[model samples]
Target: DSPWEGSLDMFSIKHFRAKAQLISGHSCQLVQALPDVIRSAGRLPPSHVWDLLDSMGPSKAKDICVIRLCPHGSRDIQNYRLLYSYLNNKQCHCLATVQQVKMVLLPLPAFEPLPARLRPLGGPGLEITHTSLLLAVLFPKD
Candidate 1:
């Protein structure tokens, strides 16, 4: 009976943390981008984010993609499990590194500020990101 068990809001960052803990069991290293990614998605619809988290697990992490979507189409790739924050520019440093490899807390560039309601209930260290992480589950053997 943990304090966060009964108190977490659905699809919230706290809930993601809890689920991540359960999945990793303190044995694995979660990509630092993960929670922020979830927080990024907090602004989106709940059902889509729920689908994203639903596929989240130890087995699927490798296949899961957490890239940012853009209008240029050059940054986008195939087999992407999750995409976040729509960017108007092509120079996005948060590009996906899952195919090969993968936080500064400074103020982000000009973007819409996240509502206080969507912010995570954590320390001041937990800053919000404009990137929204979308999820996918299928990875090919090729």
Candidate 2:
């Protein structure tokens, strides 16, 4: 049994989606509409519920940094730029400009494609099939 099985319904999907949008620099209404969708779908988790609250505008405002991790050499930079622009237009002020954006594109060492002979040990079976990206907005507050 999954550790989160019973507690799943306790989570609110609408809330999670809303919070995720906020973390990704989207509008508030987007966050406000998450609960019903999640409830209707019958798939919500506690951590997801926490993410909803943690990814709000105010929560992000307290953030000192935001780190986005993605596959190496992906188009993450373009997306991040767009997000920054959106935040600026919205007057988010937390990370409004490119200058304020301090980013580090790290190669995913563990996910680096290995040579064929060595690949089997870490390939296909060990690889992730489907993944959900979680964006964390780090606050300076304890």
Candidate 3:
């Protein structure tokens, strides 16, 4: 069995490390900006940031992530499948590459922090986002 099979928290570093081994044979390449972007998401949802860039178009976006949510039986599973497709070949190549994006750790300008919240709505698997993601189950080509 994989090292992280029975892990309680999927986001844990241990889980990620083990998961990487199962597919890529190594750890992922963390861009310098990722941590900062993640932080910004807590304060500013990605949708807001995306709206700001409408005038710039998709190509203009750099070092940004477009996440599509996935909900499991009783847990809101955050799947990065689209993220994977955005990065490289579907064959699942190594993290080190020529098309590698060089991102830097940087948070955005002042913005209202998202409500201090992250708790699962109903003990678990009942968050609004989780439901929203599920509702789109019809022909969600993505």
Candidate number with greatest lDDT? 2
After superposition, which runs of candidate 2 have C-alpha atoms over 4 Å from their true positions?
A: 1-72, 93-137, 140-142
The better candidate by TM-score, 1 or 2, is: 1
TM-score of 2: 0.20
Clashes of each: 5, 4, 3
Residue pairs with colliding backbones in model 2 are 14-34, 14-35, 15-35, 18-31
Ranking by lDDT: 2, 1, 3
Q: Score residue 2 of candidate 1 by CA lDDT.
A: 18
TM-score of each: 0.22, 0.20, 0.22
User: How much lDDT does candidate 2 score?
Assistant: 0.27
State how far residue 21 of model 1 sits from its true place (Å).
27
- Candidate 1 off by > 4 Å: 1-45, 73-142
Angstrom error of the Cα, residue 20, model 3: value is: 14
Worst 10 residues of 3 by lDDT: 132-141
- Which residue pairs collide in model 1, if any? 81-136, 82-134, 83-134, 84-132, 85-132
What does candidate 3's lDDT look like per residue over 1-142, in tens digits?
A: 2221111122221111102111111222222112211210112233432234343433433323222123222332333332223222222211111122421111111232211221111111222332212110000111
- Model 2: residue 54 alpha-carbon error in angstroms: 21
- Candidate 2: residue 69 Cα off by (Å): 8.1
Model 1: lDDT equals 0.25
